[PDB]
Design a protein around this ligand. Structure first.
Ligand SMILES: CCCCCCCCCCCCO[C@@H]1O[C@H](CO)[C@@H](O[C@H]2O[C@H](CO)[C@@H](O)[C@H](O)[C@H]2O)[C@H](O)[C@H]1O
Ligand SMILES: CCCCCCCCCCCCO[C@@H]1O[C@H](CO)[C@@H](O[C@H]2O[C@H](CO)[C@@H](O)[C@H](O)[C@H]2O)[C@H](O)[C@H]1O
Ligand SMILES: CN(C)c1ccc(O)c2c1C[C@H]1C[C@H]3[C@H](N(C)C)C(O)=C(C(N)=O)C(=O)[C@@]3(O)C(O)=C1C2=O
Lengths: 1033, 156, 48
């Protein structure tokens, strides 16, 4: 086949061209994104029940829906919380590989059939089913800078004039409004109401009557009187459209003929649907769009499309309105794609430098220049065939794979060059002979590298999804690389290389090169002399090898384990938390203070603070808040001092002394889609009829016991909220019945006034919008206001609420959690330093087993993934080991010689561990990907050494040492060139600071550490390995 | 609101005895109250932490502190059936006949939840058996309305 | 039932259409809203 194409260079070009075109086509059609899908598919059900406490939500919405989630396929687990903002979310998480569309439609269809079981007002609001395991492409902030628009004003503008056009923009899959469109707001006055013997019941009734769509019919409708001349639709009552009209609604005609209008008992205005969140952007009222990339779309094209659309909306903006971009994942895709290009460019240069430095002719220089791009292009084509995207992980695999293609290219051309110089054969004859020497091993190397990388694709869930990206990129690249090695590069060598006189090792040239050659020739003799003396004393080297192996064991064990290294993604968060009962205004003062800090003490690093009051991640409410901090580019934040970890740590310090609030900065997870992925995620479950209080006691019990083991567990804590004072009001049925007051009136009066009530819809400039009644703020603040509300009795008398009720303080939950249909409490924590999370989990299980009767537990999220992922690893590592050995045994026709290659693994792994430890890094996925490539490269060097050594004994009858020395002599130059090229080429990852540098640093310092020890040690040790193994058998 | 006052409200609520002990030595306001007017004694009584009730009382806690709706710790202890706490409060001068803003008494609350021993303790300390809430109800009315025969027998 | 075309377009057609973004392989979408209060929204997808 090499022989076939050496005689058919044009045919080989045709194959290369087809490969390039396939690659080129693939690049055009390939989806581009920051990440592949990594999280398991999750569907979320969201419901809202205006004015409802958490227990109400749970017991009339959440439990009913949960009880109907049956007959749905591939569900792993279900979880929910219900809280006192009137909100429930139920998340169902499905097995990896589940079709997210089927999962969603199955969930929504079960829900659809539970709707009739829900309260009316919850059916009115609607219940949404969505894929929630998707993440934001970007967030577009919309702010007003001239003090003319409230956040309500802005949200309505965005919904009316931006959201839909963005939704239609090419490549966007989903848009979310950070706020609501206007609602018609009727703010009732209990004094004015009582004054006319009216109640919210009357207000609601009048509104439902006087703001409505009424069907009529047709003039001359079918069936008609024959001879009828016109057919025309009758239009009767249609919905109100203005505050003026709502104000003019008729409530009562007094005896003196005077009229009570809605504007006489209420303030009417356009406003928000909800008032829980206050959003500011550098202190100014804000709204925005959360935008998600559509499947198979191009993130870069979508981003540009979005900005193009926004620009053409700009001319129509009211004054003060400004677009702003506090979150954009698109830089990361750009940086990634550029790195692939920059790496390819740098490698071509390095390969040129190293080929020329050693071989000293431009022609040999050209061959890798041609071969590497060809292999890389075709690699895109296989990614496409397999349905992968161009993304951060795949591209990162491309950069690594480029290092491998360089290696193949150099090895093939170098051997032709050596064979020419040593034998004086013409380019074509020498290419044939050279390919005959390596072709088998090249295929063996391809097999062995696959065996190393492919099994990692078979880790399940999240971990597999991440490794998959690397192993498929890398294994494709080197399958194509070998293919190009057997087809194109031999053809190129046989046709492009100039002849070398037998014996010509360039020692005769003058100048720098003549010097270098004589020097490298001398070095090769000193080297073989060394190996000769080494092989005269293999005993001590076995000892030194056990020392290396032992040291590897020690270094590996003590290296801290993490999944993904933090990144400086240009943005971070600041949690704000005020005590139970703390009000929205108080939270705002803290947010302001927080915003004032970043714009002041971080004026050189910070672009904006997006303060969100009323929102937290583990509980909403008036006393929680988040500040999203957006930074300037990594370029304007020089050095470690101005990177996120440094900024946050300084911020958390400065916020430590904030009086009555928990305020601290913290970084995003490395992959936002994937979530925290640190420590464990633990669910405590009410398995009997225990109830909330008894489950809290059991939780506290377990948390106290966790704290007694600081040596194994750290930061074991609830993910939820603590009970808070709530105001219990008891309606006295007897007194109501005796006064002639119906319960429905009482309860509707209380809830409409204090909780607010969604009456119906109206049409505002052609958009359908909600109508809400609720008391004006100052009549629903305190317990004494309760007695200012009056209900009309059957006999017409007005009865103060105080007449038929009583009240007391009690505690209750503002957020009840459930796990797989049972009451639950989520607990987070991590392993203490020096301990594994698995060990920390085992203790948690042990403390859990001592809890009161009927309290159970379960692992979820990361811990769920951790467990089932951890049970594969051994089987996958063994399969890899076995297959590598089988390939090698086939390659060498021997059950024992494979051992001499396999022994090289610690030689590179020790360097990786040493570099990682020194630089303070950890064992994470990028490090492990680095360990695999380190192993592969050292494996490759060892394989060709043993191949040559063995072939010399078999073919040329040479002795064990003779053959070994000769093999090691022949492989010195290619090993050095090949290692120099790679060390230089992977350098930028090691010193990189900025975008993705955490990942880059991880693979870089590992692969470079590993390459230094692997090439320095292997050139001395594998000659030893081969000799001792041969001797033993 | 005190630094240690707040810490004490939490410790008492959580029943962290050793912490309360330290807090007492350090002078944490025993008369600290949250937004709804609850003291540590209120909290300890509600959640039934007996030792903390005793420690607070040794340290000058107002035994008859009322919250913003006029409820006392004896109300809470009686209502949630903490018998030994009820006894302790009474021994330390709790108004057995304290009325909250609703005219509700500890006897009302204990009868409403069917707490016979606590009702007996309260009657023993002179609970007014004829006391009426804002709706003219007595503990006895509650008993027969609840269909509690034992309780009714007790109140004659 | 009973709605004129502009009413049903405002309260129904636009409401549904504005939620029809980001569906895979959507080539185009056309709808009508009529005087009998009925609306029809047709979504046409890439040929395969
Ligand atoms: C160059 C060619 C490259 C070829 C590389 C081929 C690698 C393909 C390997 C995939 C094999 C399946 O991968 C693995 O199979 C085993 C055996 O059923 C599974 O089952 C495993 O799970 C349990 C967990 O308690 C283990 O205790 C048990 O020893 C093992 O059977 C693993 O959970 C699965 O992840
Ligand atoms: C590209 C990487 C470049 C790395 C350059 C750094 C130098 C690394 C040297 C590696 C070690 C080789 O060193 C080699 O050791 C053996 C000892 O076992 C010596 O061997 C000598 O001593 C031993 C006993 O001590 C005798 O059995 C042997 O007959 C004798 O000649 C060799 O003379 C020496 O050359
Ligand atoms: C959480 N988040 C990104 C933000 C950021 C800034 C914001 O200004 C806002 C949000 C959440 C959104 C959710 C929306 C929601 N919806 C899209 C209409 C919603 O259902 C509610 C609700 N409480 O019911 C809101 O609070 C809400 O109206 C709101 O006011 C928001 C809002 O103002």
């Amino acid at each position: 086949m090499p022989n076939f194409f050496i005689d058919r260079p044009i045919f080989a070009w045709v194959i290369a061209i087809i490969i390039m075109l396939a690659g080129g086509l693939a690049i055009l059609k390939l989806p581009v994104a920051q990440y592949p899908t990594i999280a398991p598919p999750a569907v979320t059900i969201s419901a809202s029940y205006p004015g409802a406490d958490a227990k109400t939500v749970q017991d009339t919405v959440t439990q009913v829906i949960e009880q109907n989630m049956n007959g749905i396929d591939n569900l792993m687990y279900m979880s929910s919380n219900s809280d006192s903002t009137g909100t429930v979310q139920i998340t169902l998480t499905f097995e990896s590989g589940t079709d997210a569309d089927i999962a969603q439609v199955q969930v929504q269809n079960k829900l659809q059939l539970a709707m009739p079981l829900l309260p009316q007002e919850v059916q009115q609001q609607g219940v949404s089913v969505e894929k929630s395991s998707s993440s934001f492409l970007m967030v577009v902030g919309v702010i007003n800078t001239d003090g003319t628009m409230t956040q309500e004003d802005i949200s309505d503008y965005v919904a009316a004039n931006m959201k839909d056009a963005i939704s239609r923009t090419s490549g966007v899959g989903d848009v979310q409004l950070f706020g609501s469109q206007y609602a018609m707001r009727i703010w009732m006055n209990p004094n004015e109401l009582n004054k006319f013997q009216l109640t919210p019941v009357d207000v609601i009734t009048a509104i439902k009557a006087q703001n409505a769509q009424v069907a009529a019919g047709q003039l001359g409708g079918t069936p008609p009187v024959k001879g009828q001349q016109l057919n025309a639709s009758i239009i009767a009552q249609t919905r109100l459209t203005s505050t003026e009209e709502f104000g003019k609604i008729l409530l009562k005609v007094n005896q003196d003929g005077s009229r009570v209008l809605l504007r006489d008992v209420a303030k009417i205005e356009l406003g928000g649907e909800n008032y829980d969140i206050i959003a500011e952007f550098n202190g100014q009222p804000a709204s925005g769009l959360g935008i998600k990339l559509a499947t198979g779309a191009n993130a870069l094209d979508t981003a540009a499309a979005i900005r193009a659309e926004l620009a053409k909306m700009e001319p129509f903006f009211p004054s003060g309105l400004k677009i702003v971009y506090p979150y954009d994942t698109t830089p990361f895709v750009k940086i990634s794609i550029h790195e692939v290009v920059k790496t390819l460019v740098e490698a071509i240069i390095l390969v040129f430098l190293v080929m020329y430095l050693f071989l000293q002719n431009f022609r040999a220089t050209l061959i890798p220049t041609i071969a590497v791009p060809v292999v890389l292009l075709g690699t895109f084509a296989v990614l496409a065939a397999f349905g992968f995207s161009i993304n951060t992980l795949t591209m990162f695999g491309m950069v690594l794979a480029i290092g491998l293609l360089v290696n193949d290219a150099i090895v093939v051309v170098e051997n032709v060059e050596r064979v020419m110089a040593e034998e004086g054969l013409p380019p074509k004859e020498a290419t044939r002979k050279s390919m005959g020497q390596i072709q088998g091993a090249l295929v063996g190397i391809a097999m062995v590298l696959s065996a190393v990388f492919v099994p990692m694709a078979f880790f399940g869930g999240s971990t597999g999804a991440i490794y998959r990206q690397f192993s498929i990129t890398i294994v494709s690249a080197m399958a194509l690389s070998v293919l190009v090695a057997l087809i194109l590069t031999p053809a190129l060598c046989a046709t492009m290389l100039k002849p070398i006189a037998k014996g010509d090792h360039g020692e005769g040239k003058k100048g720098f090169f003549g010097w270098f050659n004589r020097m490298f020739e001398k070095s090769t003799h000193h080297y073989t002399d060394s190996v000769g003396g080494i092989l005269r004393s293999t005993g001590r080297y076995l000892v030194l090898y056990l020392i290396i192996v032992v040291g590897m064991a020690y270094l590996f064990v003590r290296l801290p384990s993490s999944f993904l290294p933090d990144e400086d993604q240009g943005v971070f968060m600041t949690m704000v938390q005020l005590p139970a009962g703390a009000t929205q205004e108080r939270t705002q003062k803290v947010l302001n203070e927080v915003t004032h800090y970043y714009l002041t003490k971080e004026k050189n690093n910070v672009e904006s603070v997006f303060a969100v009051n009323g929102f937290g991640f583990a509980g909403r409410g008036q006393n929680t808040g988040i500040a999203f901090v957006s930074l300037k580019d990594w370029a304007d934040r020089p050095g470690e001092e101005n990177k996120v970890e440094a900024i946050t740590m300084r911020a958390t310090r400065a916020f430590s002394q904030i009086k009555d609030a928990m305020v601290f900065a913290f970084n995003l997870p490395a992959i936002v889609e994937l979530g925290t992925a640190t420590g464990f995620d633990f669910e405590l479950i009410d398995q009997a009829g225990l109830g909330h209080e008894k489950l809290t006691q059991a939780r506290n019990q377990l948390l106290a016991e966790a704290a007694k083991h600081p040596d194994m567990l750290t930061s074991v804590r609830p993910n939820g909220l603590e009970d808070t004072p709530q105001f219990k009001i008891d309606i006295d049925q007897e007194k109501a019945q005796a006064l002639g007051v119906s319960i429905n009136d009482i309860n509707t009066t209380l809830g409409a006034a204090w909780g607010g009530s969604y009456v119906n819809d109206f049409i505002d400039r052609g958009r359908v919008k909600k109508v809400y009644v609720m008391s004006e703020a100052k009549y629903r603040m305190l317990p004494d206001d309760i007695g200012d509300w009056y209900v009309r009795a059957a006999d017409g008398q007005m009865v103060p609420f105080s007449a038929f009720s009583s009240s007391r303080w009690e505690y209750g939950s503002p957020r009840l959690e459930r796990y797989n249909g049972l009451p639950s409490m989520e607990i987070l924590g991590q392993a203490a330093p020096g301990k594994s999370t698995g060990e920390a989990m085992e203790l948690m299980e042990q403390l859990a087993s001592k809890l009161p009767t009927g309290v159970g537990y379960d692992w979820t999220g990361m811990s769920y993934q951790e467990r089932l992922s951890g049970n594969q690893a051994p089987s996958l590592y063994a399969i890899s080991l076995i297959v590598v050995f089988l390939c090698l045994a086939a390659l060498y026709e021997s059950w024992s010689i494979p051992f001499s290659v396999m022994l090289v693994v610690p030689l590179g792994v020790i360097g990786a561990l040493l570099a990682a430890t020194f630089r303070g890094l950890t064992n994470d996925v990028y490090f492990q990907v680095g360990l695999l490539t380190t192993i592969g490269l050292s494996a490759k060097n060892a394989i060709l050494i043993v191949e040559f050594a063995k072939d010399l004994m078999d073919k040329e009858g040479k002795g064990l040492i003779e053959a070994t020395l000769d093999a090691v002599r022949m492989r010195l130059r290619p090993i050095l060139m090949t290692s120099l090229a790679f060390i230089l080429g992977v350098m930028p990852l090691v010193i990189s600071t900025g975008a993705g540098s955490g990942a880059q640093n991880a693979v870089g310092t590992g692969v470079m550490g590993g390459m230094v020890t692997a090439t320095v040690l292997a050139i001395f040790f594998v000659p030893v390995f081969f000799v001792v193994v041969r001797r033993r058998f | 609101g005190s630094d240690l006052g707040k810490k004490l409200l939490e410790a008492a609520r959580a029943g962290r005895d050793d912490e309360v002990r330290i807090l007492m030595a350090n002078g944490a306001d025993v008369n600290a109250a949250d937004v709804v007017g609850w003291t540590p004694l209120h909290l300890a009584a509600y959640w039934g932490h007996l030792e903390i009730v005793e420690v607070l009382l040794k340290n000058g806690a107002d035994v008859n502190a009322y919250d913003t709706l006029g409820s006392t710790p004896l109300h809470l202890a009686a209502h949630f059936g903490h018998l030994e706490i009820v006894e302790v409060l009474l021994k330390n001068g709790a108004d057995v006949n304290a009325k909250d803003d609703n005219g509700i008494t500890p006897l009302h609350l204990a009868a409403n939840r069917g707490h016979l021993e606590i009702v007996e303790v309260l009657l023993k300390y002179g609970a007014d058996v004829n006391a009426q809430d804002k709706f003219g109800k007595t503990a006895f009315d509650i008993s027969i309305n609840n269909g509690n025969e034992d309780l009714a027998e007790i109140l004659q």
